[PDB]
Amino acid sequence: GPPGPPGPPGLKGHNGLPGPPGPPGP
Amino acid sequence: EPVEEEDPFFKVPVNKLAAAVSNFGYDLYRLRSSASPTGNVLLSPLSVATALSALSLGAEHRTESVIHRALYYDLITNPDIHSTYKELLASVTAPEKNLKSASRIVFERKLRVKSSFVAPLEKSYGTRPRILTGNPRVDLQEINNWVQAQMKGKIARSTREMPSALSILLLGVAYFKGQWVTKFDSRKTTLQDFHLDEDRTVRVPMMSDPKAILRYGLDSDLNCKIAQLPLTGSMSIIFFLPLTVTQNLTMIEESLTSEFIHDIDRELKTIQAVLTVPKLKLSFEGELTKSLQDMKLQSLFESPDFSKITGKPVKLTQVEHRAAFEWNEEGAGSSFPLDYHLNQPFLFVLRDTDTGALLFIGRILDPSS
Amino acid sequence: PGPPGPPGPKGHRGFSGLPGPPGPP
Amino acid sequence: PGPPGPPGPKGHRGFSGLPGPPGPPGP
């Protein structure tokens, strides 16, 4: 028989890492 | 600027990797032998290096670079060194090798391990990480069960409970009970003296082959004679036998590398010899953590960068090795002479002929123990 | 006939957060 | 019948990261 369809979409990707800390204050 | 070609043996990739991992093995045996001036040293460092190189999968550049340097990978050129490692491991653990060698990465309980790291680890190294449970009695039993299964129950179970502050433990076990190419005749195995030093002596049971055939070489600068005995499955033990009766093996030990061992195997000459080898049966259960630290590997123990394993700040905390090793008269059959009597302190090395890998290494100051 | 294939891979990881705010003077 | 299908398509890019914390003080 014919090849089945492609599967469902993969899950959303992982959360971005937290940003770096700010510059030193004035 | 032009230079001679490298020995063709080391131009094969699996052999070039076997030599690199084996050279780490010789570095570790020197720190083990130097850290204990009496007793035997029995050591199968491949399972240790295997556990180290697998862990380097989840290591990010600056600390994978330190694992690569200690493993002699920085001299090797290879796009896919971890798949050559898979290749290497399938050679030396094949059934006719009679060698069982297993590595395991053990992690602190409740650690989420990125499967970006489990997947390669599993393709190249054939092992799965062990996430501890927190129950120390049952954690011990799981590893004693895993060693018992990977070594067909031929190593003893640890009585020791693993430490409370375990982040990353590395376990390498190995067992060898080989088969001589030419049997020893049991009927001529007798009890005879073994000289612990010039004064002290012990009687140990020594096998015998008074018209034996072997590859021989007297090394005049290291003051020892070297004989090579062949093992089933294309392996061999190379013995180092000093001329004087001395427990000082320091010049032999300072020279062991895979390239030195390989030139010996090239230049040994076939002779007839009066050969006596004692029976050998030994075990080791021990933590090699400190010997690794002064192997320029201490950074692995203080804020390492294993980000490809997990986002949790983890750290190498323990390296455990068990090993058991035996030989006896058993072999396949029956296939002026010189004296070769191993009735004094001697080094032996078990080498895989196909890859040149170091499979076991021993310092026998006493086959009584 | 034929059966549907496996779900695809998980997407790329998000962009990292921006650099935080400046400190106190 | 016939064979299983292809792997489905790759998921979307994940949520962006949270902003970093405030920087240090300075005289």
XYZ file of C-alpha atoms in Angstrom, chain B residues 102-335:
234
model
C 32.041 -1.650 30.964
C 31.734 2.057 31.728
C 28.935 3.945 33.474
C 28.078 7.564 34.226
C 26.253 7.987 37.547
C 24.398 11.215 38.315
C 22.935 12.858 41.411
C 19.300 11.981 42.070
C 16.526 13.978 40.380
C 18.723 15.329 37.576
C 17.096 16.084 34.235
C 19.639 15.073 31.586
C 19.254 16.648 28.148
C 18.589 13.863 25.670
C 20.827 15.831 23.325
C 23.453 14.035 25.482
C 21.819 10.637 26.069
C 21.447 9.994 22.345
C 25.119 10.185 21.197
C 26.308 8.551 24.461
C 24.054 5.650 23.575
C 25.097 5.294 19.926
C 28.862 5.441 20.456
C 29.241 3.945 23.928
C 26.334 1.522 24.348
C 25.560 2.681 27.893
C 22.767 4.564 29.662
C 23.247 7.098 32.490
C 22.309 6.083 36.025
C 20.163 8.611 37.889
C 20.489 7.882 41.597
C 17.414 7.583 43.777
C 18.531 8.940 47.178
C 17.942 5.573 48.871
C 21.616 4.687 49.491
C 21.048 0.979 50.212
C 19.168 0.465 46.957
C 21.490 2.700 44.892
C 24.401 0.500 45.933
C 22.439 -2.589 44.969
C 21.595 -1.185 41.518
C 25.280 -0.677 40.654
C 26.319 -3.984 42.162
C 23.562 -5.374 39.927
C 24.834 -3.498 36.878
C 28.469 -4.582 37.392
C 27.210 -8.094 38.116
C 25.379 -8.176 34.785
C 28.070 -6.520 32.668
C 30.788 -8.790 34.109
C 28.833 -12.085 34.279
C 29.215 -12.004 38.049
C 33.006 -12.306 37.982
C 33.747 -9.122 40.024
C 32.812 -8.865 43.711
C 30.070 -6.537 44.917
C 31.029 -3.341 46.680
C 30.151 -3.226 50.389
C 30.801 0.511 50.307
C 27.918 2.950 50.089
C 28.414 5.801 47.652
C 29.102 9.220 49.186
C 26.397 11.638 50.229
C 27.620 14.452 47.959
C 27.693 12.707 44.580
C 27.241 14.909 41.518
C 28.893 12.893 38.716
C 30.468 9.529 39.505
C 32.362 7.547 36.838
C 32.575 3.750 37.082
C 34.899 1.567 35.000
C 34.921 -2.207 35.542
C 36.921 -4.807 33.637
C 37.554 -8.536 33.847
C 39.989 -10.798 31.992
C 40.549 -14.555 32.124
C 42.311 -15.438 28.883
C 43.538 -18.566 27.136
C 47.188 -19.186 26.324
C 47.901 -20.123 22.722
C 50.109 -22.959 24.003
C 48.760 -24.640 27.147
C 50.891 -24.999 30.221
C 51.070 -28.546 31.507
C 49.353 -28.676 34.896
C 51.460 -31.686 35.911
C 54.594 -29.513 35.978
C 53.047 -26.631 37.926
C 54.947 -26.833 41.205
C 55.305 -24.679 44.275
C 58.566 -22.746 44.074
C 60.212 -19.679 45.569
C 59.319 -16.153 44.503
C 61.772 -13.532 45.737
C 60.000 -10.484 47.136
C 63.496 -8.973 47.327
C 67.098 -10.158 47.751
C 66.502 -11.370 51.318
C 62.800 -12.180 51.619
C 61.218 -15.078 49.739
C 57.783 -16.703 49.377
C 56.639 -19.962 47.805
C 54.012 -19.433 45.098
C 52.660 -21.963 42.550
C 54.507 -21.428 39.254
C 53.464 -22.964 35.954
C 56.230 -24.288 33.771
C 57.251 -24.901 30.169
C 60.944 -25.870 30.121
C 61.090 -25.893 26.315
C 58.805 -22.913 25.676
C 58.641 -20.808 22.520
C 58.258 -17.038 22.779
C 59.459 -13.699 21.423
C 62.363 -12.319 23.392
C 64.446 -9.175 23.756
C 67.031 -8.133 26.314
C 66.954 -4.380 26.895
C 70.374 -3.343 28.107
C 69.586 0.273 29.023
C 66.468 -0.489 31.115
C 68.286 -3.528 32.576
C 65.480 -6.001 31.903
C 64.597 -8.896 29.642
C 61.254 -8.840 27.853
C 59.301 -11.866 26.681
C 55.964 -11.962 24.858
C 53.425 -14.777 25.240
C 50.496 -15.144 22.819
C 46.857 -15.310 23.946
C 43.776 -16.664 22.124
C 41.670 -14.130 20.221
C 44.793 -12.319 18.975
C 46.135 -10.823 22.207
C 49.388 -11.117 24.087
C 50.992 -10.487 27.475
C 54.390 -8.709 27.377
C 56.395 -9.258 30.551
C 59.149 -6.995 31.860
C 61.714 -8.908 33.924
C 64.623 -6.957 35.463
C 68.060 -8.530 35.591
C 68.694 -7.871 39.271
C 66.107 -8.961 41.829
C 64.660 -5.541 42.638
C 61.263 -3.993 43.296
C 62.629 -0.832 41.622
C 60.839 -0.922 38.285
C 60.959 2.858 37.885
C 62.882 2.991 34.606
C 60.619 0.452 32.901
C 57.526 2.243 34.188
C 58.834 5.665 33.165
C 59.136 4.389 29.580
C 55.783 2.694 28.987
C 53.861 4.250 26.104
C 51.921 2.674 23.258
C 54.749 3.570 20.807
C 57.413 2.063 23.070
C 55.294 -1.073 23.540
C 54.762 -1.188 19.757
C 58.492 -0.972 18.922
C 59.098 -3.801 21.406
C 56.533 -5.912 19.573
C 58.283 -5.062 16.304
C 61.780 -5.965 17.496
C 61.201 -8.993 19.743
C 62.873 -12.122 18.366
C 61.494 -15.677 18.477
C 63.561 -18.028 20.671
C 63.302 -21.179 22.759
C 63.274 -20.569 26.477
C 63.037 -22.229 29.879
C 59.909 -20.333 30.987
C 58.317 -20.228 34.438
C 55.259 -18.033 35.061
C 53.421 -17.977 38.425
C 49.676 -18.311 38.639
C 47.989 -14.916 38.866
C 44.572 -14.085 40.356
C 43.920 -10.559 41.585
C 41.207 -8.028 42.269
C 41.045 -4.294 42.772
C 38.260 -2.121 44.123
C 39.259 1.463 44.558
C 38.638 5.171 43.886
C 41.060 6.651 41.312
C 39.802 10.206 41.909
C 43.052 11.744 43.183
C 45.278 10.182 40.517
C 43.024 11.787 37.905
C 43.214 15.170 39.671
C 46.986 15.479 39.280
C 46.588 14.201 35.719
C 45.939 17.901 34.880
C 42.246 17.084 35.308
C 41.466 18.952 38.537
C 39.278 21.521 36.769
C 36.670 18.780 36.244
C 36.180 18.941 40.038
C 35.482 22.701 40.380
C 32.865 24.579 38.284
C 33.118 22.555 35.032
C 31.007 23.361 31.972
C 28.822 20.309 31.255
C 26.044 22.415 29.726
C 25.334 19.800 27.078
C 24.355 17.430 29.911
C 22.097 19.717 31.917
C 21.615 23.307 33.008
C 22.298 22.377 36.624
C 25.875 23.252 37.697
C 27.261 19.715 37.956
C 30.768 18.544 38.618
C 32.924 15.418 38.534
C 33.086 14.082 42.099
C 34.139 10.390 42.002
C 35.905 7.914 39.693
C 35.585 4.266 40.758
C 37.393 1.273 39.266
C 36.987 -2.430 39.856
C 39.092 -5.024 38.053
C 39.701 -8.743 38.349
C 42.365 -10.642 36.469
C 43.452 -14.271 36.198
C 45.650 -16.667 34.295
C 46.342 -20.366 34.734
C 47.751 -23.288 32.742
C 44.731 -23.382 30.388
C 45.373 -22.815 26.702
C 44.505 -24.074 23.247
C 46.986 -26.958 23.026
C 50.669 -27.787 22.405
C 52.323 -25.565 19.789
